[PDB]
Design a protein around this ligand. Structure first.
Ligand SMILES: Nc1ncnc2c1ncn2[C@@H]1O[C@H](COP(=O)(O)OP(=O)(O)OP(=O)(O)O)[C@@H](O)[C@H]1O
Ligand SMILES: O=P(O)(O)OC[C@H]1O[C@@H]2OP(=O)(O)O[C@@H]2[C@@H]1O
Ligand SMILES: O=P(O)(O)OC[C@H]1O[C@@H]2OP(=O)(O)O[C@@H]2[C@@H]1O
Ligand SMILES: [Mg+2]
Ligand SMILES: [Zn+2]
Ligand SMILES: [Zn+2]
Ligand SMILES: [Zn+2]
Ligand SMILES: [Zn+2]
Lengths: 193, 143, 248, 278, 353, 353, 278
């Protein structure tokens, strides 16, 4: 009844982490995580790979209602032993879909000025990474500029462009579509073209 | 009731010296068919102590712990958790734990294995306490 | 809008020790002196209004922003770039192990200065403006006299031309000539650069020559307020009358 | 392949996962020292445990590992670390910076420019650039948090006043992404410019101090200096005695008690590359 | 000209072989066994267990043999091995009231319930080198008293019943584990005790000695020092009920410390606590003394000695870190030294000009 | 009623017998020999010689056996024995240039005249517990290079010839001997070095580690660490000429430390010095680092760490004193405790009244 | 007789001579801590090495040695010291204060008054009475030299203000010969009055701290106090449960966990003397 995790947990976790590290250190670069054949429906392959690679008992995980399913919760508990929390403010990893709200987004922990790593990482499942509003990325990880047009909610688009939380506070966004992954850390300057 | 008895015999096996337990088991010539469910694994048990012996918990290091699990032919699960790194001793302890849950073995081994081990340990403890008590400082005697 | 607005500010260590229910307004280009009997809470009020002490009650707005509602980083930035703070003890606002030039240039570098020669030249100029010789720039403040140290802490908190400067007995330990030289400097900065000053002092002459408005504190309570000339020449509270009479 | 009896890269999966999360947080917060639950390694603390942990957490079967200490692959500790990684991972190793996918380094950035998909892992004794000014972490954590780097500028000003120069010659502080003052590890001032807008990921590991920090590719790294005292790299009056390069960091080798000495490239791979080209 | 050659690996291998041969020593003598070290060098084993973090006598003795008797190296070996071991369980909180005593003394009362059990100790011995140990000897025949163990209440339980001291109450607070997260200053008392138990015996002994000499004094009395066998129990998930997995030889030290006069409760003694593996008790006493010294923030004490400086004491207490970082200077540093030299040669040429 | 009885002497005797039996351990195992401890636990012997004050390997190993491996107790045993020995002569000043080297490394230059001799060392070993030592093994066959020893000039002599450092000059000053007179603060550098050599390894290591971490930093480099055999010579009165009485295995550490810019001479590196018996070198390195830290008065340095506080460092450095005074709390203190109690009980009554 | 293989009293003649000179200097300078080159003893530092050295330096074949710890002859450490002295000197030993010529004591002055030609040797942990106020010897030496004891008076005043009483209950400072403030060793306040104008020589030995000081017979020893807070000795609501004395220092013996306790004389010899007299 429970879903299956990596066939080769060590190697697969290492490869997925390297892909995610490439995405985060080079924001806007799309990376494919091929190790997991199928995701934990409704979670996609990339999201499941990220959770299996990073989630454990020390990292509370919050699943949004659209993505919250009994099978998914049991599989996460069995494979990662990550505590499941019902509130976004208690989550080290937040998993949502396009239906995320401005309230849930601002409830996510942003860390503190003395402990900016004490915030949350948002894994947002998007309809596509290509067909959205054109976005220009500049900053660390980007030589001059990068162009990406993911289909993003308006609250996520507003978070990326205005950055209400001053650096070093803020969430690091992970966009997932199928097996493809894109990353935008809190440092990335995002402009709407 | 039964849980207390199981705790008692598990404690006796854990506190037993591996050599004496092995000798006693070989002498008993117990014919039991078991599958090792968990191979004897040596790891660490994290030690929790208390401030002032009674107050808040704090981590006072770790100790080596060996665990083993067996399953008899009838589905009886025997377990063992023993300080140290003796895998064979842990396997024997788990086997005896499984056997003691069977009616045909409980009273027999309770009298031929568990009681003689506990008595021997008690004798060792009493002898050591007799040696140690010679160092007690005598101050006053009631007349 | 007032540069600094204080509303019902209160902070008490114990009944009668500190201040309570203190409110006032400060616009650019005017000086607000504070006087009162020793231990009246003037220093506590000055620390509270300079982001150095969280009040138990009341509020402080600076440019339409609550002073203590912002992050600690913003308050530190304000105290680092555009806010001067002269302390009653000169060594509090000085670095003992850092030379006078370094003490003055820390404030310049915090504002973006990155040219060593210009920083040194400005430090020498300001050391001279506060009546300390330039050859002492490389000397540590521990080798300076009390007046020299106080005049170093004034130079350190005025080198960046801050908009708002809080002072606690700035004239203490200064001779009359250098005192007047430091009052003229403050008047020039206020009239030219539109600097705002909140000064705590006991020498009523300094307040009269400098303070545009005056406050009187007693037992932690603000008893009298208004224009400096009106308060000094036409006091109303009995303590103000006693204080003006005590003038030598 | 790994045939040592340990888990691949000697780290348990929980420790690897925790270090990986720390690496991602460090990448998202360039220049910030991310605390991590570092474990004791077969190497003593202060002998590269942080770098070993980072490499173990990132390394894979397909990576080509390059280990250099003082710029040389044959250095004692570099040999020990490389042999440990060969034993517990079986990965391919190289002395050529160009052919390396992972570079673990102590005190040198290779002369050969790094490229995309390369990760260079630095071993850091003191992850806190403000430590020698303020020994206490309780103060430096808040100094980082409130971007209060006034103590470093004063230190540089006083160094210039006392000596006419900035006394710091290695582990020279650098501002990262315009915000975080960072220690680049005890690399010489010569190597600091290589950090600016590099096309390779830079990871920094302080195992004993339990910190991890990183610089993403193409990130601004600016050494603290003054306009009239611009950042100047080490210089020698002699070229390398083996390859003749004038652009490499040089180590002084004393040949005898009479004072005869020769200067040779610390980056032995670059020295070989130049010598073969003739 | 000169050509570079490879010498690092073979030099390393030869150095290791030399060290191994020196460890073996003269081959005419039989090689030492780990069992002999465990039995006859038991106090060194106690220190190695306590600081290395594993209460396994055989492993500590093995580390001592491998380290050629170097306590620092053996401790680091044991800690490194700890890193490779899976955590199988967390013990139920130790109950020292159930200790089977080998030694129980109290400095605050002449005689106490259960008595002054000296036990195996070097206390009151005349430290004269015993040259008979140069040759094989015969172990003494031990005198035997009654076998029963008398009720031994903790002396602090006797003090607290009188109101002279306060019971150590459990609020259920989850202990901090510095083995899983790096210490954050100021540290909780649980974290402080955990670090001190792992701390260097000599460093903490010197700090405690300084406190006795006025550098942050806390007026210590040895309320009770208890050494003996304490049972360890775990609640495995496979069963759901407590199982006794064995016993550990441990030493517990409780220190009475200078009384305080709180505004709203009667004046009472303060206290410090120490707990170590094995019989070596001076480590436990130093741990208790430094614990009391580091309790200054709780009691609002004005620090008068380094022993009360929490960061300074704890950041440098672990001899794994300290020994590693001091020894790391042996590593090649010629790149960094060349940088320092490059500057000095210029500041020498600018001064002379 | 109650009558007093005599129990002290028999309790003491029984405790000593218990300790002796525990030291012997299981009798099935052969008793350890002092020779085995000297050969195979050589680093513990090195520490015991260095801190106990006698460079006699057999005596230190005997103390370790007698102390059940307790380094503190063994050190105190050796020091106590030292007290009973007549001083027959004072050695001529040691000349480390004549050392027959087992190990010579320099962290400041990649290669030096005479080379980087690693020698017997645990440096660069993977600290993995070697379980093969649980059973008897075979010592490795040592590789043999050329037998000649290359000229090994002190690296500091190479630095001083360039003007980068200053030669350590001898003014003929008579060294202070803290074994004959109690230390007087501030102490001369000779007295400081003598005390540090006798000081606790862990305490000094922690202090040096703190200096490396900014608590009184001195920017250290290991200019040279030399271990080997150095000849001892005396000028007996019966003959009037120097006689070589033997050789001692010793380790010398020289630390380069942060340069200074004196007003009237070119800027130069400062230095620290460490010297220990045997091969254990971390003690020598810590000694050099703390020596440099305590040199602050000479260089007019503003103290920023406890390692620079001479009285605090030295008064608590000797683990003989520190261990003795910490352990003395185990002595009966019920008279003093009764006094503290008599007062506290009155303060409680008055507060309650 | 001595048949142990050591020199009589275990001390070499040079050490004995140095300690003897120190004793004479201390006698000529009452209350002053005389530094001496103390040696390490078979007993650990802090376990009575100073007293052992003083006794060894003064003791003779004809002396009758009494050793007491906490007022009792049978105390562990007292037994050890007495046995050591019997081994290395062979002198006669006694438990009777009246019959003793030399008394080595830890924390008690005997209840039985001392007489002429008796020497009482105290074991002292901290020879400096100002140590707990000022831990550094560099300052206390000058405080002694310039008779600046203002820090002790302030300490007493603050103790009275905070508690209403002087917190010090043992090792209570005493002025000697009107000049030197001295630590009488950790004897209780109960015993301090015995020191005043005593007909016996008092010697104090701090072996670990390397100090020797003395009070000659018939010397003024005045405990520091105030007129309105006069020096008050410890008091108990119960007499001794064995001999019934109300004038002896009492030790509390806990009989059980239920809180039953009895108070008995610490000076066991005095207790026996009273009990026999009935
Ligand atoms: N930490 C504290 N605890 C208790 N009372 C305090 C504290 N700090 C200040 N006080 C008291 O609060 C009152 C206000 O003191 P404050 O320093 O503000 O006076 P002031 O008017 O600035 O003094 P002056 O003009 O004499 O320098 C005084 O009674 C002072 O004693
Ligand atoms: O803490 P670790 O174990 O990760 O060691 C990091 C660094 O600290 C030491 O100082 P170093 O920079 O000279 O080189 C050594 C080592 O590479
Ligand atoms: O320094 P030493 O060796 O001469 O010991 C003197 C005194 O110091 C310790 O403290 P204490 O007074 O409780 O009793 C012990 C001992 O008697
Ligand atoms: Mg004031
Ligand atoms: Zn070259
Ligand atoms: Zn280094
Ligand atoms: Zn004491
Ligand atoms: Zn009596």
């Amino acid at each position: 009844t429970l879903e299956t995790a990596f066939m080769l947990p060590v190697q697969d976790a290492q490869h997925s982490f390297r892909r995610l590290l490439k995405a985060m250190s080079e924001p806007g670069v799309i990376v494919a995580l091929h190790q997991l054949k199928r995701g934990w429906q409704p979670l996609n392959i990339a999201t499941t790979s990220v959770l299996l690679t990073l989630a454990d008992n020390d990292t509370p995980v919050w699943l949004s209602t659209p993505l919250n399913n009994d099978i998914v919760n049991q599989s996460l508990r069995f494979h990662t032993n990550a505590p499941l929390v019902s509130q976004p403010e208690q989550a080290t990893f937040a998993v949502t879909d396009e239906a995320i709200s401005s309230e849930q987004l601002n409830a996510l922990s942003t860390g503190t000025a003395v402990a900016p790593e004490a915030g949350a990482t948002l894994i947002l499942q998007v309809a596509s990474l290509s067909g959205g509003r054109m976005l220009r990325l500049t900053g660390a990880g980007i030589a001059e500029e990068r162009m990406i047009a993911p289909q993003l909610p308006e609250c996520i688009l507003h978070e990326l462009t205005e950055r209400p939380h001053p650096f070093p506070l803020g969430i690091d966004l992970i966009l997932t579509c199928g097996e493809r992954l894109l990353a935008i850390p809190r440092t990335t300057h995002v402009e709407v073209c | 009731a039964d849980t207390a008895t199981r705790q008692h015999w598990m404690s006796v096996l854990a506190h037993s010296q591996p050599a004496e337990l092995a000798a006693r088991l070989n002498a008993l010539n117990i014919t039991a068919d078991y599958e090792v469910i968990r191979a004897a694994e040596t790891g660490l048990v994290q030690i929790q102590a208390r401030m002032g012996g009674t107050g808040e918990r704090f981590f006072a290091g770790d100790a080596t712990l060996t665990r083993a699990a067996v399953r008899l032919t009838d589905g009886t699960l025997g377990y063992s958790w023993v300080l140290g790194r003796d895998k064979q001793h842990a396997e024997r302890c788990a086997l005896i734990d499984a056997l003691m849950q069977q009616s045909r073995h409980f009273q027999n081994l309770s009298e031929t294995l568990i009681a003689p081990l506990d008595a021997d340990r008690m004798a060792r403890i009493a002898a050591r306490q007799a040696e140690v008590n010679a160092s007690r400082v005598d101050f006053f005697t009631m007349v | 809008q007032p540069l600094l607005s204080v509303n019902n500010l209160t902070h008490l260590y114990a009944p009668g020790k500190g201040f309570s229910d203190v409110s006032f307004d400060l616009w650019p280009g005017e000086v607000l002196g504070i006087v009162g009997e020793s231990g009246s809470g003037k220093t506590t009020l000055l620390k509270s209004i300079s982001a150095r002490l969280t009040p138990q009650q009341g509020e402080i707005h600076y440019e339409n922003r609550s002073l203590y509602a912002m992050s600690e980083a913003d308050r530190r930035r304000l105290l680092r770039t555009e806010w001067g703070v002269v302390h009653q003890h000169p060594l509090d606002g000085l670095r003992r192990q850092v030379s006078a030039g370094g003490n003055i240039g820390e404030r310049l570098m915090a504002t973006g200065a990155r040219h060593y020669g210009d920083i040194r030249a400005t430090a020498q100029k300001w050391l001279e403006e506060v009546e300390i010789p330039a050859n002492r720039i490389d000397d540590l403040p521990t080798t300076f006299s009390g007046g020299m140290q106080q005049r170093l802490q004034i130079a350190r908190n005025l080198v960046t031309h801050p908009k708002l400067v809080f002072m606690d007995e700035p004239t203490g330990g200064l001779d009359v000539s250098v005192q007047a030289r430091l009052l003229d400097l403050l008047r020039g900065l206020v009239v030219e650069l539109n600097l705002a000053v909140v000064i705590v002092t006991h020498d009523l002459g300094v307040a009269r020559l400098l303070a545009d408005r005056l406050l009187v504190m007693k037992q932690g309570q603000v008893v009298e307020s208004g224009l400096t000339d009106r308060v000094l020449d036409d006091p109303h509270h009995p303590y103000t009358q006693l204080l003006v009479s005590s003038v030598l | 392949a790994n045939l040592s009896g340990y888990n691949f890269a000697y780290l348990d999966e929980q420790t690897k996962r925790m270090i990986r999360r720390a690496i991602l947080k460090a990448v998202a917060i360039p220049g910030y020292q991310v605390p991590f639950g570092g474990r004791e390694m077969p190497m003593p603390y202060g002998w590269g445990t942080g770098g070993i942990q980072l490499t173990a957490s990132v390394i894979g079967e397909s990576d080509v590992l390059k280990v250099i200490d003082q710029g040389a692959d044959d250095t004692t500790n570099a040999v020990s670390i490389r042999n440990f990684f060969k034993r517990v991972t079986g990965v391919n190793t190289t002395e050529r910076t160009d052919d390396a996918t992972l570079i673990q380094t102590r005190h040198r950035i290779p002369e050969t420019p790094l490229t995309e998909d390369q990760i260079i892992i630095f071993q850091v004794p003191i992850p806190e650039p403000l430590r020698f000014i303020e020994p206490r972490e309780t103060e430096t954590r808040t100094m980082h948090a409130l971007e209060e780097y006034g103590v470093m500028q004063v230190k540089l000003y006083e160094d210039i006043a006392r000596f006419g120069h900035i006394a710091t010659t290695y582990a020279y502080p650098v501002k990262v992404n315009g915000r975080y003052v960072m220690d680049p590890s005890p690399i010489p001032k010569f190597d600091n410019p290589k950090m600016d807008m590099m096309p390779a990921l830079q990871l920094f590991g302080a195992g004993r101090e339990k910190r991890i920090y990183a610089v993403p590719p193409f990130t601004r790294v600016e050494s603290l200096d003054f306009d009239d005292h611009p950042f100047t790299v080490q210089q020698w009056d002699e070229p390398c005695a083996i390859c003749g390069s004038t652009h490499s960091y040089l180590d002084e080798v004393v040949l005898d008690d009479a004072g005869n000495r020769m200067f040779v490239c610390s980056d032995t791979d670059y020295c070989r590359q130049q010598s073969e080209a003739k | 000209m000169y050509v570079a050659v490879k010498g690092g690996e073979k030099a390393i291998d030869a150095a290791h072989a030399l060290q191994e041969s020196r460890r073996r020593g003269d081959t005419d003598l039989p090689e030492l066994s780990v069992a002999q070290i465990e039995q006859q060098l038991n106090l060194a084993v106690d220190r190695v267990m306590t600081e290395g973090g594993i209460a396994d006598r055989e492993l500590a003795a093995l580390a001592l043999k491998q380290a050629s008797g170097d306590n620092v190296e053996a401790i680091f070996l044991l800690r490194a091995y700890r890193t490779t071991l899976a955590k199988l369980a967390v013990s139920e909180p130790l109950d020292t009231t159930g200790m089977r005593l080998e030694r129980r003394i109290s400095a605050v009362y002449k005689d106490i319930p259960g008595g002054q059990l000296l036990g195996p100790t070097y206390d009151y011995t005349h430290r004269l080198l015993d040259f008979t140990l140069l040759a094989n000897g015969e172990a003494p025949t031990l005198t035997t008293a009654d076998s029963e163990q008398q009720p031994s209440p903790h002396v602090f339980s006797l003090l607290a019943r009188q109101g002279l001291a306060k019971f150590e109450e459990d609020s259920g607070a989850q202990p901090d584990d510095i083995t899983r997260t790096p210490p954050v200053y100021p540290c909780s008392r649980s974290s402080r005790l955990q670090q001190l138990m792992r701390g260097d015996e000599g460093y903490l002994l010197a700090l405690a000695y300084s406190t006795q000499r006025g550098y942050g004094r806390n007026h210590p009395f040895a309320g009770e020092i208890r050494s003996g066998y304490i049972d360890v129990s775990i609640v495995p998930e496979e069963l759901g009920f407590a199982v006794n997995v064995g016993e550990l030889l441990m030493t517990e030290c409780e220190m009475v410390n200078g009384f305080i006069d709180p505004p709203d409760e009667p004046p009472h003694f303060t206290r410090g606590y120490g707990l170590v593996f094995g019989m070596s008790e001076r480590k436990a006493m130093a741990m208790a003394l430094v614990d009391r010294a580091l309790q200054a923030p709780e009691y609002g004490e004005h620090a008068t000695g380094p022993a009360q400086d929490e960061e300074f004491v704890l950041a440098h207490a672990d001899n794994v870190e300290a020994a590693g970082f001091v020894s790391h200077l042996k590593l090649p540093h010629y790149v960094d030294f060349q940088a320092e030299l490059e500057l000095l040669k210029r500041l020498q040429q600018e001064k002379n000009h």
